Design a protein around this nucleic acid. Structure first.
Ligand SMILES: [Mg+2]
Ligand SMILES: [Mg+2]
Ligand SMILES: [Mg+2]
Ligand SMILES: [Mg+2]
Ligand SMILES: [Mg+2]
Ligand SMILES: [Mg+2]
Length: 117
RNA sequence: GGAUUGACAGAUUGAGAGCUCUUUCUUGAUUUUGUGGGUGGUGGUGCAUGGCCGUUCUUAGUUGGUGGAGUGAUUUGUCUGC
């Protein structure tokens, strides 16, 4: 569901858990750091997503949310001073959650479900 | 899918300065380039100013209130003496 994703992104934004990008994401996945990964399939030439898959194959669970620009928007990359979006364009190709921070029950049931697949 | 940051080694440099280049690696929204604006300045103006000090002046000199004289600026009080 949509709720657990925003909850986990908030809990990793406040405690610096988001590997906002792909190089930091790749380094976190290579290390014992990246506990979750959200990436978009609407990526040109698709090789970055394939490389990410590989990173998660070796810290396993991944999420397949679309709308890269929207993904960055609700990923907290924006300063979002006003109520509405105050920046033209901002987005993230890959988001990696390292620090689980605060825990909510619905989100943990969701991550167990996505682990079960 | 990199605003950016930093650097081993060499050219360069006086430098063991990643100042600049060769290559590449690191770093994550603090930044970078433009506008407004702001700071910093033993920059200018002591002939824009404050404060302070110096000097006129180490002398004994100043001042206003009622009163008198002048239309008045001013004067007497602040003086002939000792
Ligand atoms: Mg100065
Ligand atoms: Mg100077
Ligand atoms: Mg003067
Ligand atoms: Mg005097
Ligand atoms: Mg009089
Ligand atoms: Mg007199």
């Amino acid at each position: 569901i949509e709720d657990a994703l925003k909850v986990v992104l908030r809990t990793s934004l406040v405690h610096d858990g988001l590997a906002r990008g792909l190089r930091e994401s790749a380094k976190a996945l290579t290390r014992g750091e990246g506990q979750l990964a959200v990436l978009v399939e609407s990526v040109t030439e698709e090789a970055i997503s394939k490389l990410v898959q590989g990173l998660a194959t070796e810290n396993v669970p991944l999420i397949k949310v679309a709308d890269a620009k929207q993904l960055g928007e609700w990923a907290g990359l924006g300063k979002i001073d006003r109520d509405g979006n105050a920046r033209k364009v901002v987005g993230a190709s890959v988001v990696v959650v390292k620090n689980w921070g605060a825990d909510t029950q619905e989100r943990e049931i969701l991550l167990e479900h996505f682990s079960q697949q």
